[PDB]
Design an enzyme around this catalytic site. Structure first.
Site, PDB file in Angstrom:
ATOM      1  CG  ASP A 132      22.533  58.506  -1.236  1.00 29.28           C
ATOM      2  OD1 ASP A 132      21.695  59.421  -1.201  1.00 29.28           O
ATOM      3  OD2 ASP A 132      22.400  57.489  -1.959  1.00 29.28           O
ATOM      4  NE  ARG A 136      18.166  58.380  -2.209  1.00 34.17           N
ATOM      5  CZ  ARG A 136      18.004  59.645  -1.829  1.00 34.17           C
ATOM      6  NH1 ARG A 136      16.788  60.155  -1.642  1.00 34.17           N
ATOM      7  NH2 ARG A 136      19.059  60.415  -1.627  1.00 34.17           N
ATOM      8  CG  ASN A 137      19.945  54.985   0.166  1.00 35.84           C
ATOM      9  OD1 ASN A 137      19.496  54.376  -0.804  1.00 35.84           O
ATOM     10  ND2 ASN A 137      20.598  56.125   0.058  1.00 35.84           N
ATOM     11  CG  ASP A 150      22.236  51.398  -1.618  1.00 36.66           C
ATOM     12  OD1 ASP A 150      23.347  51.864  -1.978  1.00 36.66           O
ATOM     13  OD2 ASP A 150      21.437  50.858  -2.403  1.00 36.66           O
TER      14      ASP A 150
END
Length: 255
Positions: A132, A136-137, A150
């Protein structure tokens, strides 16, 4: 790694997270009487199923030690369950890029990509597949330091073999990293805006790719296109990406 609740002073909400909101706070700890920390919270942590998935993140984060990967501080495993992490005071990368869109130079954007490649080369060296990788992470610790932050499907980031067969490998991580590089160079714009998640795979198989961001150096865009080889075996590894990014960064700093 267990932290008594009384040692934590929960402060302001900094952002949203996968399982709940993330707050800043203070950890009044023996080693430091006022350590600034991030506190991840978990709604529905009374569900054993959710609580287990949430806390797996802590276990995973604890295995790593890298300058561009956020560090675990501790956990509170009674309800409400919290994860106590290193605080990256400038927050989420996407927001940071959008807000500082006209203050961040090209050299900074390239630096962020390079730093993330260093973390991902480290994870590759440990045979760990992330699954992922996306802006955003990523978190921002300083104007010159980002960290991977994350550890429903992010279809618009995913390699074709991940969408088609739910296969995730080191190679599929490289495809996603290419997307994350695009996002950075786009100042935090999402890939495939206006496209339904169901239509993404069709465009990929038709050979379509995210276009060259405005002001992106051609060497860097070409690196992105290598990450987006349809055949996973033709994608570079992170050692090579790191090396190439280091050269691109230095070229840019020499302008």
């Amino acid at each position: 790694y267990e932290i008594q609740r009384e040692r934590i002073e929960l402060g302001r909400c900094i952002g949203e997270g996968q399982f709940g909101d993330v707050h800043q706070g203070i950890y009044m700890s023996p080693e430091n009487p006022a350590m600034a920390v991030a506190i991840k919270t978990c709604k529905n942590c009374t569900s054993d199923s959710v609580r287990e998935k949430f806390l797996q993140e802590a276990l995973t984060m604890r295995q790593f030690d890298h300058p561009h990967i956020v560090k675990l501080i501790g956990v509170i495993t009674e309800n409400p369950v919290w994860i106590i992490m290193e605080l990256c005071t400038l927050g989420e990368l996407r927001s940071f890029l959008q807000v500082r869109k006209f203050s961040l130079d090209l050299a900074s954007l390239i630096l962020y990509a390079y730093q993330l490649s260093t973390a991902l080369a480290y994870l590759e060296s440990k045979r760990f597949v992330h699954r992922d990788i996306a802006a955003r992470n990523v978190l921002v610790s300083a104007t010159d330091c980002v960290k991977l932050g994350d550890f429903k499907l992010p279809i618009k980031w995913m390699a074709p073999e991940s969408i088609n067969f739910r296969r995730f490998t080191s190679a599929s991580d490289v495809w996603m990293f290419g997307v994350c590089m695009w996002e950075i160079l786009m100042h935090g714009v999402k890939p495939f805006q206006g496209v339904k998640n169901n239509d993404v795979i069709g465009r990929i198989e038709n050979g379509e790719r995210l276009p060259m961001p405005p002001n992106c150096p051609p060497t860097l865009y070409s690196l992105m296109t290598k990450c987006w080889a349809y055949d996973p075996s033709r994608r570079p590894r992170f050692t090579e990406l790191k090396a190439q990014l280091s050269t691109i960064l230095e070229e840019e700093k020499l302008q």
